Design a protein around this ligand. Structure first.
Ligand SMILES: CCCCCCCCCCCC[N+](C)(C)[O-]
Length: 74
DNA sequence: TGACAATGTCATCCC
DNA sequence: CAGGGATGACATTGT
């Protein structure tokens, strides 16, 4: 199969959570993660970029569906 | 491997 | 605040 780059990222950077986790975990969850873990700044930054992408791709989705839904047919 | 579809990324605006 | 939803353009990936 295959992995996301963000998964590779998280992995390369030894993040205590997964890309998937990162992006889907709830905010309060994430916050625990962040108050409890030793995370360089780079790792912190990373986690934020990952979540961004992570939420945006989902978002990209819909859009398109709506895009594609709304015109293509209806 | 090359076409064509599909997904992801990023910049921006928004709330 | 901040985080995060929309969407348009461009990029990478999948089949
Ligand atoms: C959707 C659920 C995602 C939230 C998962 C949180 C689990 C992270 C725990 C990592 C543990 C690492 N450590 C430092 C405690 O050993």
């Amino acid at each position: 199969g295959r992995q996301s780059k963000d998964e590779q990222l998280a992995s390369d950077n030894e993040l205590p959570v997964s890309a998937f986790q990162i992006s889907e975990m709830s905010l309060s969850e994430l916050q625990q993660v962040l108050k409890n873990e030793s995370l360089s700044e780079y790792q912190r930054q990373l986690i934020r970029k990952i979540r961004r992408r992570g939420k945006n791709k989902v978002a990209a989705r819909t859009c398109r569906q709506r895009r594609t839904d709304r015109h293509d047919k209806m």
